């Protein structure tokens, strides 16, 4: 698990990977780790998978309740206050590591949330198991107020450093670009890893398995 | 050794065209207190091989004492032979494996750089007797931080010159100052060539703090 | 520690248990009964802790009789067996867990005879034969050897007598007497008691 | 793991399964659990793979020297006693060994049982293993001292099959040896799935 | 406090042919959630007819390899001949039992040719029990390779299929297919595939790349 | 973590490092360790990060509500009482190192110290954090009664930099703040 | 562990216009079997099944609680349930016992009620949904089931070869497991009919 | 777990044990012997661990026979009993402690018959009767009730039969057979085996 | 316990508190924490009392025997090597905080530090003991290269008194010692 | 309270002719570090009774808050009644006993001095609810050190004047400076009379170190 975010001169680029493991066995080769919050705010999830999923759906339901009652666009600082106040009440039992990012009237805002309830406003963050590898790419190559394709090149470089570290991915590098007006979301942005071809004949025969009892039930 | 009192930190190393460069800092921390601000963590073995280490520093003075004796013991024979850098890597592995079998290990992690017969050498030695060779090595937290920067350049370009390698180490030593809690902004760089072992002085880094003016 | 057996026939259910109420070395009672008549066609066998056997099985005993008096008719052995599983699983993740092992024996007018198995973790099963206790190991492979799905009620008693003589031979506990029931279309009939002259 | 052994009028019958596991993972299905010590002695494997493999090979190293120094085969009670003293010196250190010793002797048949705990007992019938308790009942229901040779082959082949049926740690093939007066002889080796078509049919 | 063991991963495969033997392994050395190197093969040419593979704890693999190579020379000058395949498996069982109460954390597979010219594969445990098999797969991905080779080599659970012996060329593509499928689901496997073929004419080597994640 | 507070004739002077660590890894490299509550009252926090952020939000909620009812600027001693009522009550649950400082119209500059226990005491100068043990001998041999504002900014800059010399939970960058009757001057020091 | 107390193996596999599901038959305590007719696949409406594996208590418990909520859903609405809707229903039921959790891992397989589109997914013991396109597996012998499905699966398969692939995947993997076996039942469904077959496996 | 008995007479010693060699549920051997002829007038009974019973008691067995062959005459039962106590106490504060329980039975030409008791902590005693195992609790008060210091050898067998029927009644373990010896001025005579038809 | 050692141009200056405690009770109220080995070489000890007294007797036995054979005054680096050969060898058994200082004719004043681990290093000044953590920020902001003898006696007197301010393992009385080519001047400071 | 963070130390107290004198130091130590050099550990209750305490100081500010409220709550009635020093000793014992029964005690040890109706009063309160009366009290290590000096004089002379009592406390407070590791050379003396509660300033001791010149 390797997630990262950055703030360029106009918006926020998020990045993640596509592997969920159970033990030391790859359970999923294509998992979505970038979650919807609002039409300007997205959130990357890390930690316990079911804890991050059920948390990111509740707060996204409250902001849809909030903004439709209010009648205007939500704020990133509102989603910051809801998450750190909920997670503090569970005393860190819910294991959720989140990267919160969005563009408000006041501009872009990027946060990092720890499962005990501590939040940090930063221009660039990494979370997850391979966060140590992705952070070294940032500090070597971050400069303030980058352009669009310059910032997209930095994140896909930083995520790929964690992929070629352990607990990487069956790689489909994801990107979510949030700007002041345009919103992008790219699942197959980069496929660096391919599965090799199968060079053997595995001809399953029509009748090579003994059957004790058959049963037919039609439908309509 | 069951409790390491005075420990070091990450040690780097990478090959280039006709030599191996190794850098480490000069810090003698005790837990969280940095008690010793001026120590040397790189040992110059005779003319071709070269040693830097991490882990417990009192155990490092013991191996500095023993390896210093064995090199003198061969030079007094004068039979035209010396220890290859691979032979030091072989002896040191058997010393660490025989020590952990008595359940009284040496708390170290050692990197051996050497250049002999026109060939570079870069070897790793673990506390548990795990040893291998690599074109680039990093210990401690450097295996999480500087090691992705090492393997990125060596796959896009397999061979490096001396100036390309030395500039790349100072970039990685700059990074470890930002996020390792046991780092130190005064380090030294050691380099083997065909001319012999050469150790540079207490160099420093150049930091950036322009993101502090942001919120 | 104590023993049960569950021989199922084509139109009958043969069950038997032991009659020992021992206390850690001594044998305080040698005519103990572990057979609970739930209704006119359903028995109940209970093996477990000291107090958990009597308290839970009588809670089921005085709750099936409530269904008979209130609705005018009787539970099926399947529905009665699948109500007992509901009460362990609901009272398992609580401060008072019940640690008993059960097996149910019933006859139905529409489904014939039936046997159900029960763990102390509330797992149902539908078995042609079952057993409990430490003696379940030494005896069921004998019953696995000579079982026939079409077997008479007279050969089942002879098969039950083969099943208990090896428990007299290679089992460390004493277990001298064994009470035996039988359930058919007429009801619960009490067969004669089984005892062992050893030598 | 399930082994058994019983002696009768015409010698000793030895039978075992062939399944060895590792936790909940089956390692192999062709494990030979009856170790051929001599042309006149047989040993079993029950509990611990290398523990029963090493010390019986060390016993076979010892019985050959006894034959050379004394120009005579070793007795069955002698070899079971030598095995008991070697294991007893490592008592409490964590060995696991529950083997059996079979063979013909000048006194006739021979059948002893040796534990890693230190139990050395003789007897007529034995059954060792995790699924051993499933094999005592089906054997003793059909056991007699005056059984025939073909009848005794079918009794032990039945008893391993009923043990591998109920137990989860028992399966594979069913080996079967026969100890005659001159020496042991391999009878057969049958798959469990082949016996299932024969017995249930 | 100090703990003397750690797991390093690895996967070793051996197939006994009719007149050949194939030993295959990956070259990934890892620990915890880090990759030490991508070039560290597990094949070791003992003699001209015997190749051993060593998985598990890597510090014991470097020690146990050098002990066996010393005793090969100790056999030869005492006997004026080289060891057989079965003699090494008998010698290795005594070495592994010699540290019974402080065991090597090494899984071992010996493949090679016998004195008749046929294939022979011996599998091991960390205490020293062994048997001769036709095919074994040891290491971290051992559970992901044994059921497939039972279908293809052993022909288990198949109906109306003749038992043709496995040729050399058919055995090569079976090895190349199982490591592609194993590197997908296992994390301790990848980055290369070293394959050693032992025949009556020497030992061949071949390297096939895998996915690098 | 090392925090610092010195009062003078006009008001108070605050200061802290950043370096939010976990284990031996720096998670946050630059950090606002000092937090505004009111326009004249700051606090600098130490201990667990998630605990001190939750307390500082509740005190800002309670004190900010309380001053609007009175239509008066709040007292610094009033704000230090509210941290005491939560840290002493919810002890064995929180690890907080709060130091409260700020200017008040009734009394001038004040500095209060609320350690991990839950007690409250007024001091002339106050230290705190993990790296505060190393400068305890320097801070009392250098302190002198009757300093100006520019001396106290010089005082806390040298005092923090000795705890921020190398010690693994400290360093990074110096954030200073001066609170007086006129305004609040905040600055970031490096090099 | 607690999952290894009774054993089990549930596999689902997606075909061209059809979907298959299979499970074992052995019921038993840790080393002692009890019976060979333990149901682990339960019908939840037509052309949509569910498989359960894990602790045998929670298999029979959750399958009754889910049936409790399904019949109340299919009466307030005249329609049947969509396969995406059931996955959200099961994930709600497991997450309510967040700290008292049921010890099972469900596998859902079925077709679309309107179109012919198949659907497979699996969940964790606390309710993490995970949809795939080829296969999902659950139970104790999971690692053996990944080794068979990664090598034998083909993208577009008729119901003839799909049955033969899931047969060889279940037989060769469960025979490597010790606490699972004693018979394998296979359900293969499609738009027109539902076919249930039992296989000839090793009874040891 | 297993049982011993030590009835002492005016000119005889009546001893008996059981014949069970069980393994934790099963009963592997039902004709086991726990009686060790140390010499022509001294027996030995041993109850303890798995290996410690055979290894220690044969070390005493092949050391009293050395005294007979080397000195031409035989140990007294007192000196033979007080040598066994020396070997436990010397090998008690070491890495290999022996955990067995003993009782010794001997006849002397000058002192008559004698009985000695032995703990697993090497404590000697001189008792008119003794027992071991869990069955020692239920049976010795019967033997305390009817004992007479001047009792015949025929009433002692009848008193032994009274002593074993209550062990058949209120003791959880099986214990079907009981071998019996007797020691007099002529030597060790083997009496008939004792078995129990239970019901 | 707090010990101190500063070299200067002529020789070295030593200093220590006394207060040998146990639990929270002072057992010994005035204590010679510095011990003569040779006529020019002292050591000041810290850690366990019974461990450091046994080591200082053996080193005095070995070094005192060694200089009579050579008929030469011993080296200070020779004496610091002998503490290293015992503390590193018998580690996990001893808790010693030995600092070795003294004048030598070949090299002048030298100060060595042997902590609880067993390493050896030469320093310009050296601190040690339990109370040494409190003056680490004062001792490096006050130190200046090129002091005289009278400045170093003034330096260590103020440096010890800040660790001896109140800290429970320290205080009591100040024992100072100056070692040069001429002689050894020892004095006791109070008030 | 399971872990006392900031603790005090020994508190003394002894009766005399028409009053009770109580002295304690002014130290706020945290473990071995003396973090707070200037605190008050003696509380002046209204006019006759008086409280000094040891143990945890954050718990002492809580009882300073509650006892301060109850005295105000009676004085606003103005019915000519007040709390006797024995009634404070009765209430405080029931407060400590009810607190330990919930297994969440107050880490304190308290000494109550009072003078009412021409009678002195000196009461002890333990953390565990153990309470008694005595002519002289000492807490902490003072019960081992100053307490034998208290009972020696009171048996040779049962009654004392004010100047004899005040001089005797300064001798015992001098002793605790020598051998208590948590002592402090700045203390204050509080005294009740018929005139009311009076607290003296931060007095100091006078030490002797002439045995340092011995070997």
Short mmCIF file of N, CA and C in Angstrom, two decimals, chain C residues 82 85-86 89-90 92-93 117 119-127 136-137 140, chain G residues 5 27 29 32 34-35 37-38 55-58 60-61 64-65 100-103:
data_model
loop_
_atom_site.label_atom_id
_atom_site.label_comp_id
_atom_site.label_asym_id
_atom_site.label_seq_id
_atom_site.Cartn_x
_atom_site.Cartn_y
_atom_site.Cartn_z
N UNK C 82 -34.07 -27.59 15.97
CA UNK C 82 -33.53 -26.37 15.41
C UNK C 82 -33.90 -25.15 16.25
N UNK C 85 -30.75 -25.21 18.95
CA UNK C 85 -29.55 -24.58 18.41
C UNK C 85 -29.64 -23.06 18.49
N UNK C 86 -30.86 -22.52 18.46
CA UNK C 86 -31.03 -21.07 18.53
C UNK C 86 -30.66 -20.53 19.90
N UNK C 89 -26.59 -20.41 20.53
CA UNK C 89 -25.89 -19.41 19.73
C UNK C 89 -26.24 -17.99 20.17
N UNK C 90 -27.45 -17.78 20.67
CA UNK C 90 -27.80 -16.46 21.19
C UNK C 90 -27.17 -16.21 22.55
N UNK C 92 -24.20 -17.39 23.60
CA UNK C 92 -22.80 -17.78 23.49
C UNK C 92 -21.84 -16.62 23.64
N UNK C 93 -22.14 -15.48 23.04
CA UNK C 93 -21.31 -14.28 23.17
C UNK C 93 -21.76 -13.42 24.34
N UNK C 117 -27.33 -34.18 15.79
CA UNK C 117 -26.11 -34.03 16.57
C UNK C 117 -25.96 -32.58 17.00
N UNK C 119 -23.02 -29.89 18.98
CA UNK C 119 -21.75 -29.57 19.61
C UNK C 119 -22.01 -28.60 20.76
N UNK C 120 -20.97 -28.30 21.54
CA UNK C 120 -21.08 -27.23 22.52
C UNK C 120 -20.89 -25.85 21.89
N UNK C 121 -20.63 -25.79 20.59
CA UNK C 121 -20.61 -24.53 19.85
C UNK C 121 -21.82 -24.38 18.94
N UNK C 122 -22.89 -25.16 19.18
CA UNK C 122 -24.18 -25.07 18.50
C UNK C 122 -24.05 -25.29 16.98
N UNK C 123 -23.64 -26.51 16.64
CA UNK C 123 -23.56 -26.94 15.25
C UNK C 123 -24.49 -28.13 15.05
N UNK C 124 -25.49 -27.96 14.19
CA UNK C 124 -26.42 -29.04 13.89
C UNK C 124 -25.84 -30.01 12.88
N UNK C 125 -26.33 -31.24 12.93
CA UNK C 125 -25.98 -32.26 11.96
C UNK C 125 -27.12 -33.27 11.88
N UNK C 126 -27.14 -34.02 10.79
CA UNK C 126 -28.12 -35.07 10.56
C UNK C 126 -27.33 -36.36 10.33
N UNK C 127 -27.26 -37.20 11.36
CA UNK C 127 -26.34 -38.32 11.30
C UNK C 127 -27.08 -39.66 11.34
N UNK C 136 -16.52 -42.22 22.75
CA UNK C 136 -16.97 -42.09 21.37
C UNK C 136 -15.88 -42.49 20.38
N UNK C 137 -14.62 -42.39 20.79
CA UNK C 137 -13.51 -42.73 19.90
C UNK C 137 -13.42 -44.23 19.68
N UNK C 140 -17.15 -45.97 17.77
CA UNK C 140 -17.92 -45.62 16.59
C UNK C 140 -17.41 -46.31 15.33
N UNK G 5 -10.99 -24.75 12.78
CA UNK G 5 -11.65 -25.64 13.72
C UNK G 5 -12.54 -26.66 13.02
N UNK G 27 -18.04 -32.38 7.35
CA UNK G 27 -18.27 -31.71 8.61
C UNK G 27 -17.51 -32.43 9.71
N UNK G 29 -15.13 -31.89 13.79
CA UNK G 29 -14.31 -31.22 14.79
C UNK G 29 -12.87 -31.48 14.35
N UNK G 32 -11.63 -35.07 13.95
CA UNK G 32 -12.66 -36.10 13.86
C UNK G 32 -13.80 -35.58 13.00
N UNK G 34 -17.64 -35.88 11.35
CA UNK G 34 -18.95 -36.26 11.86
C UNK G 34 -19.86 -36.77 10.74
N UNK G 35 -20.02 -35.98 9.68
CA UNK G 35 -20.91 -36.33 8.59
C UNK G 35 -20.38 -35.74 7.29
N UNK G 37 -22.56 -34.55 4.71
CA UNK G 37 -23.69 -33.93 4.03
C UNK G 37 -23.98 -32.56 4.61
N UNK G 38 -22.93 -31.81 4.94
CA UNK G 38 -23.09 -30.49 5.52
C UNK G 38 -23.23 -29.47 4.41
N UNK G 55 -16.10 -21.01 10.58
CA UNK G 55 -16.64 -21.67 11.76
C UNK G 55 -18.06 -22.12 11.48
N UNK G 56 -18.36 -23.38 11.80
CA UNK G 56 -19.64 -23.99 11.43
C UNK G 56 -20.82 -23.41 12.19
N UNK G 57 -20.57 -22.73 13.31
CA UNK G 57 -21.64 -22.00 13.99
C UNK G 57 -22.11 -20.82 13.15
N UNK G 58 -21.17 -19.97 12.74
CA UNK G 58 -21.50 -18.76 12.02
C UNK G 58 -21.94 -19.03 10.59
N UNK G 60 -24.19 -21.50 9.80
CA UNK G 60 -25.63 -21.68 9.95
C UNK G 60 -26.31 -20.45 10.53
N UNK G 61 -25.57 -19.57 11.20
CA UNK G 61 -26.20 -18.41 11.83
C UNK G 61 -26.42 -17.29 10.83
N UNK G 64 -29.11 -17.77 8.19
CA UNK G 64 -30.47 -17.55 8.65
C UNK G 64 -30.76 -16.07 8.87
N UNK G 65 -29.77 -15.30 9.31
CA UNK G 65 -29.97 -13.86 9.48
C UNK G 65 -30.09 -13.16 8.13
N UNK G 100 -17.30 -8.16 17.87
CA UNK G 100 -17.76 -9.48 18.22
C UNK G 100 -17.96 -10.39 17.01
N UNK G 101 -16.98 -10.44 16.10
CA UNK G 101 -17.29 -10.78 14.71
C UNK G 101 -17.63 -12.25 14.48
N UNK G 102 -18.43 -12.48 13.45
CA UNK G 102 -18.69 -13.83 12.99
C UNK G 102 -17.46 -14.37 12.27
N UNK G 103 -17.19 -15.66 12.45
CA UNK G 103 -16.00 -16.28 11.86
C UNK G 103 -16.41 -17.03 10.60
#
